Design an enzyme around this catalytic site. Structure first.
Site, mmCIF file in Angstrom:
data_model
loop_
_atom_site.group_PDB
_atom_site.id
_atom_site.type_symbol
_atom_site.label_atom_id
_atom_site.label_comp_id
_atom_site.label_asym_id
_atom_site.label_seq_id
_atom_site.Cartn_x
_atom_site.Cartn_y
_atom_site.Cartn_z
ATOM 1 N N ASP B 90 0.870 -1.169 0.000
ATOM 2 C CA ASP B 90 0.000 0.000 0.000
ATOM 3 C C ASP B 90 0.922 1.239 0.000
ATOM 4 O O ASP B 90 1.369 1.675 -1.070
ATOM 5 C CB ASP B 90 -0.975 -0.057 1.200
ATOM 6 C CG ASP B 90 -1.980 1.119 1.230
ATOM 7 O OD1 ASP B 90 -1.910 2.047 0.380
ATOM 8 O OD2 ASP B 90 -2.857 1.093 2.119
ATOM 9 N N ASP B 141 -4.710 -9.129 8.126
ATOM 10 C CA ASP B 141 -5.536 -9.100 9.302
ATOM 11 C C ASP B 141 -6.282 -7.785 9.474
ATOM 12 O O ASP B 141 -6.009 -6.809 8.811
ATOM 13 C CB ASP B 141 -4.674 -9.259 10.542
ATOM 14 C CG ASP B 141 -3.834 -8.036 10.813
ATOM 15 O OD1 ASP B 141 -3.127 -7.590 9.917
ATOM 16 O OD2 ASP B 141 -3.883 -7.515 11.940
#
Lengths: 155, 157
Positions: B90, B141
């Site tokens: 990201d 997660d």
């Protein structure tokens, strides 16, 4: 020249991992367990096993007698499971076990894919004294990433 | 009251991993490569990918918690062909530190493989480009949850 003989195929491993994950899942369903991966060899087994546990689990990694990478989380009052690809002498393992018990976990158990001939509660296969490679097990750094496990006759 | 929706099935992932491994295998066949797993999220992808490379590769692991390296590279990387393996990229902040850190060790080359890339240094091997969405499973997660799902889902928190 090294000679590799078949031993455990990807499918044999996959079925065994599924079976161990089921025993584990059913014993730890409500216990919010932490799975500890013993690097570098336990990593393939670890990912395959934790994937088959159908509820969220916490994962952590250690590597080695001294620790190169130690546990980075609070284990107090947590149900802990140590995951190993293979257990032979258990020297590294005994160090981990003793080290983890000082952190006061609610419990501690071990799962090993292979156990060469503290209690080990989950066992994949008991094996005679033979040189195995693949699925995390290496011979002087070689064959670690084979998807299956083989018997090696060193050249 | 989290809601999960399907996104990438185990089979989609398996197929994508196999195609990435095929490109990587051809490009690194004679280069005795070192694959660096970025823990904790890269681990599922890493094992699946390295398994599909039909020749021995060397594996190593790094983990970051200011940047805290809980685990650094434990091997000599000089004149070695290095591949950094990530589940997702990201912002790339930790990754940029790793890249720069690894270049000081004088590797013969350095490339990155990421399963997911959310829409500076080039990423040579990319599984899927994805829009800005919250994904979980297969190493990803949400506040420590869902990391071990065998497939990838979209999460409505």
């Amino acid at each position: 020249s090294d000679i590799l003989h078949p031993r455990f195929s990807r499918e044999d491993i996959s079925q065994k991992v599924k079976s161990l994950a089921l025993q584990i899942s059913e014993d730890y369903k409500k216990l919010n367990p932490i799975f500890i991966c013993v690097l570098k060899g336990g990593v393939y087994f670890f990912t395959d096993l934790t994937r088959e546990i159908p509820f969220s689990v916490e994962i952590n990694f250690v590597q080695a007698i001294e620790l190169l990478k130690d546990i980075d989380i609070d284990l107090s009052d947590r149900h802990v499971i140590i995951v190993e690809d293979i257990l032979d002498t258990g020297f590294t393992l005994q160090y981990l076990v003793r080290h983890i018990f000082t952190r006061n976990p609610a419990s501690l158990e071990i799962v090993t894919l292979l156990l060469k001939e503290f209690p080990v509660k989950y066992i994949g296969w008991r094996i005679p004294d033979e040189f195995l490679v693949g699925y995390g097990l290496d011979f002087d750094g070689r064959y670690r990433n084979l998807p299956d496990i083989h018997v090696l006759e060193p050249g």
